Amino acid sequence: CSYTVSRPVYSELAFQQQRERRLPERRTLRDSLARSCSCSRKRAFGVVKTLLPILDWLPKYRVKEWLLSDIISGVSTGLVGTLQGMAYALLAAVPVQFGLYSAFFPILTYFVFGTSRHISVGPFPVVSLMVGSVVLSMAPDDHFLVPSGNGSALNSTTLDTGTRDAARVLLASTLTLLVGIIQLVFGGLQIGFIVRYLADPLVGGFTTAAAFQVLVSQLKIVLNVSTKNYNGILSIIYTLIEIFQNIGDTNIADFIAGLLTIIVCMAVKELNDRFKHRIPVPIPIEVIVTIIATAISYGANLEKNYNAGIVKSIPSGFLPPVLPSVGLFSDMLAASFSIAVVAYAIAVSVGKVYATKHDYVIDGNQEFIAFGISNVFSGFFSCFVATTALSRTAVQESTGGKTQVAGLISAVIVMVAIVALGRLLEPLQKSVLAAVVIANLKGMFMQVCDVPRLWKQNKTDAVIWVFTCIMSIILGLDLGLLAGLLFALLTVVLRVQFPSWNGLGSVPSTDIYKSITHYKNLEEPEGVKILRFSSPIFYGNVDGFKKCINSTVGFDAIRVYNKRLKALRRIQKLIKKGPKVPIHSLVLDCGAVSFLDVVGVRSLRMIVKEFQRIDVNVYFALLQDDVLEKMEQCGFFDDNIRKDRFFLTVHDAILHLQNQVKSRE
Amino acid sequence: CSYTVSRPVYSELAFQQQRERRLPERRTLRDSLARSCSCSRKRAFGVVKTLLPILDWLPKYRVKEWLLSDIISGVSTGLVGTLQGMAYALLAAVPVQFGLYSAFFPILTYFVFGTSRHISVGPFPVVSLMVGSVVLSMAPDDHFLVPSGNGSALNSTTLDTGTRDAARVLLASTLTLLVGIIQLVFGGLQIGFIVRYLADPLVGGFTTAAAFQVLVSQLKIVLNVSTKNYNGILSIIYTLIEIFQNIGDTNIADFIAGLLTIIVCMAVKELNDRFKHRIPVPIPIEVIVTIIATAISYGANLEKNYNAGIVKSIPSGFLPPVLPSVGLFSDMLAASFSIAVVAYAIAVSVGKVYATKHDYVIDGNQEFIAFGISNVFSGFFSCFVATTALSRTAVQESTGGKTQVAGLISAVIVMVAIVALGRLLEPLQKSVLAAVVIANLKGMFMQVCDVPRLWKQNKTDAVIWVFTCIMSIILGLDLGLLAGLLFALLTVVLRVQFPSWNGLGSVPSTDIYKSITHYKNLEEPEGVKILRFSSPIFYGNVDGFKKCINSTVGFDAIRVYNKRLKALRRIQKLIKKGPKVPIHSLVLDCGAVSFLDVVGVRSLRMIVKEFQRIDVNVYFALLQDDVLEKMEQCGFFDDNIRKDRFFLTVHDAILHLQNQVKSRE
């Protein structure tokens, strides 16, 4: 209808007199810590239900059809997960059966502490790549070349296949234990705001660069070339150059097989993704391609006749738990922190996606605790860091997944594999397992197509994507994340250091104030100049505010007073012998401020004092209550700078100025 | 008088229809660079006048009366400068004769390019500490112990007094040029916002902890003990213990003489500063205490009889310019960046203090060019980084200083010293020069008295002060600055990640909205709940906004919709066999937002979408123009989320709801 008001001009004190405030809540530290710690059985039951969410979804089961859905999803996800684990085991520089280990214990551990229903905990290409990189950095190949074998001229320093795998597995287990400890520390301390800094473009660029490096590593594995595990600055460029220089030492059979299975898997995946209306259940192309590869590789002796590369080192059994080799935390702390934070970010992303898909709640700290306990339990059985693969997670979602029982059934497949299924997988070529990893990289490789879309959107967020992707390629992958978080924080600081100030004016016959750089037909008060300044004043944008004021008033408050003094000395000597014209007042519409940064309130008081010498009043329009209460403690309201200078709304200041001009000429 | 308005409820589109906007300015990249590069003589005359400000104050000089005030201040600061200049030379591990060079060449260069009038360019105790810090690390004492002197058992690896200074002086000369080049880079590229991050508490806590390290460094010379130049983590802590372990190797002749001049110089300094009404010109106690010290040290043979420490190595002459030893920039790149930024910080700090005293403007970017060429010209004559000592600067201002000519006369006093005055200073004890530095540390030691004052003020700024002081002590002095800059910028991110949200309500019979946690007698609309959120939404505080909205409404928009489906399944099965109570609408008073961070608008659109399922409208109150124009490019105004949802003022959103409920029950 109509918007009409009728009230006197309450600037700061005409509203503060008759209005009674609320007394602040008493701290009472003793009572605060006492009331925080509860003793009733209700809080205990609540924290027990929250810490172990397994007792929640179990009593309300729907076994009738849920059992069949869970068993089919379990067998499907078990096949997919054992394949992905035996594939990713190469990325961690560990034997292939440790991938089956890491596909068994984390699933069991994420059953009594998890809080999700559509998450398949297991390996991940990015995490496996980071683990392999830090293992190669902390345990290179040229550190175990034992001289033996009666060489031609010098000592026969051949490869140390064998005992070196034990050292690599011990290093990976120590890394996993440290990652789990870091996750449990982050969870128990209730600190969850530390992972909010990994923005969507940042994690997107990080996953893109990690997928590119995974493609490089898998191409190195498929081509069957011997590199020098270059790490550090430009590691990916160095290893790509080394691959391009070692093209002659390739294997035609392995390369042809890898290219063929890549083409087949990609074509079948695209066909299944496109024609979803006719086939709801995704065809397990991984399973059939692995079966046919094992069949072909076993019939014809590809190992002997074609000199192919097979595993032929599967022990096909369990092992007793081994205590982790404590003592290498100082040289892997940052790597473990990076691995933990990226794993938790990917886990939270997948959880939120598959939760908003099925409309259920997922707690962050509980997921952190669950993944921490999972990594800790994995460290005691020679496993690497566990996460949720988006490809494997989609399997249980498409085939039908209701509870974690489908995941528990998925562990039964890996269970029967570790003991029995895998002795027949002996003649399987390593290039076959190295191919499905590349085929699963389609999701992260298509993420590059959003950069043109982000450019039409906020450009600062698009630069962060490119900055993260490039920095996570030049200066390694683990250090690239730290270069991305700091760059994002710097971009946030820059957006508040250079605000968007305007020339706010008055709309005729109304009281709403709009910017002058956006609207044309606006009337500003005669002599009065209004200024709006977002991005609250801190120690960095103080000079920015000075420049903004000097630009919006046309002159400089310092130079005007300097010229006044230079003209005054001629006045004081002539009697012995014998700029600030248009501006009348300044209204600062500081309504978009949150903090004040007293280092900045000092400069604000300096500005107000300097404008007093040139007889130009500087008022305030829409300062908040929490801002004025903070400025009061900062020593700003002296005997000269009273509260009448501040106002409540922008139009009240203009009305007061007009009334003062009318009553005082 | 009265504040009354009468206008219809223009929410977003009722105001946008009849209001014509201004067309944005055409970029025209071709014409932009052409219009920027001017060719007229007025623009050419301006850039030359600003680059060389000497042609400004020289033609309008007042030689009649100004020369008298400069000739008395030049001989005054000249004697103070030649003593403080050689005293700070000990902090740079260079001979005492090179300290006189740093008081002659930088003054001459700050005459044709300087832009100030009350600044005495010269050495500085804090800057000289950072210079000598990298000299000890890149050229330690145990790197030149030549075995010679027919020792007792092993090779006589005695001290290398003599050619050892050439290794440190040449290293200091390379540091001076590299610092000067960095200052020219920031000046040439016109980038001056990088020094705005050095806040007052940051530079205050830095100089406080640096002065504490100067006390430890100068006490080493007073006690005449031999340390092991410990550098790195806990550098000051390690060298302090080594001093306490080497108390037995003291010198009572230097200790008594050193402690005596400490009390004398401090007493007269406090006496003259207090009794300013009777004596306007500060008594040069530093000058008289040195002349009387040389007389006593020359009369009685303190060197031979008392085994004191004298210089006795002053060549008293000039030297041809030597080319800098290029090739050590890689090991001094990170160090020079820290020294270059603190030299300019103290320059503007001391500069702006005396600028508002005489009311003259000082160009910030010109100081980078001024000190830039100063250090470059200083590097060609074996000098260290030049700055402005607050103690020496106060001398030329109190004794009477109008222009840089007073500094030019002060250079003549140092000029006659390099040739003649200084051969008589041979028997001067090094403890005397090492004690006058400690006496001037009173100004930086009394800076600790502001921490209780800052605690009553904004506490976050007080923590940065303590954080900078401690970090600049544990992990060195140069690395402590970087730890303070990152911590200060992080505090800005923390202040915007955890905003100050309130429960804004309506004041009766008015239209101004105040917070509910500050005022008592406020009436909120029936069913409507208003929420204000400062610190604009970015990728970090977006999760906090969800908890903020869930806290102000009492419920969770996600759990309520999940409980609806939990109850809907019973409804769809009973027909086959046979929370959100108070909240009516949500008004988000996002009037304190500056940026939008499209990464966050994806969740912002999700918020409006989530509350739509529970039949709870979420409106907007005071969104700015530059923010709504940004959300449009982010893909937010779809066929369902129109512009009618947004409003101009907070009361228009409330008035519209009252009219909508009255017209639609």
UniProtKB/Swiss-Prot annotation, chains A, B:
Family note: Belongs to the SLC26A/SulP transporter (TC 2.A.53) family.
InterPro entries according to UniProt: S04_transporter_CS, SLC26A/SulP_dom, SLC26A/SulP_fam, STAS_dom, STAS_dom_sf
Cytoplasmic side: 1-70, 114-118, 196-201, 268-278, 349-367, 426-431, 491-665
Name of this protein: Pendrin
CDD domains per record: STAS_SulP_like_sulfate_transporter (cd07042)
Physiological role: Sodium-independent transporter of chloride and iodide. Mediates electroneutral iodide-chloride, iodide-bicarbonate and chloride-bicarbonate exchange with 1:1 stoichiometry. Mediates elctroneutral chloride-formate exchange.
Transmembrane regions: 71-91, 93-113, 119-139, 175-195, 202-222, 247-267, 279-299, 328-348, 368-388, 405-425, 432-452, 470-490
Organ and tissue specificity: Highly expressed in the kidney (at protein level). Throughout the endolymphatic duct and sac, in distinct areas of the utricle and saccule, and in the external sulcus region within the cochlea. Expressed in the parotid gland.
Principal location class: membrane
Lineage: Eukaryota, Metazoa, Chordata, Craniata, Vertebrata
Pfam families, A to Z: STAS, Sulfate_transp
Extracellular-facing ranges: 92, 140-174, 223-246, 300-327, 389-404, 453-469
Residues covered by the STAS domain: 518-657
Subunit comment: Interacts with IQGAP1. This interaction enhances the chloride-bicarbonate exchange activity of SLC26A4.
Cellular compartments per GO CC: apical plasma membrane; brush border membrane; extracellular exosome; membrane
Recorded catalytic activity of this chain's protein: chloride(in) = chloride(out); iodide(out) = iodide(in); hydrogencarbonate(in) + chloride(out) = hydrogencarbonate(out) + chloride(in); iodide(in) + hydrogencarbonate(out) = iodide(out) + hydrogencarbonate(in)
A GO molecular-function annotation: iodide transmembrane transporter activity
UniProt keyword list: Cell membrane, Chloride, Membrane, Transmembrane, Transmembrane helix, Transport
Organism from which the protein derives: Mus musculus
Membrane-protein topology: Multi-pass membrane protein
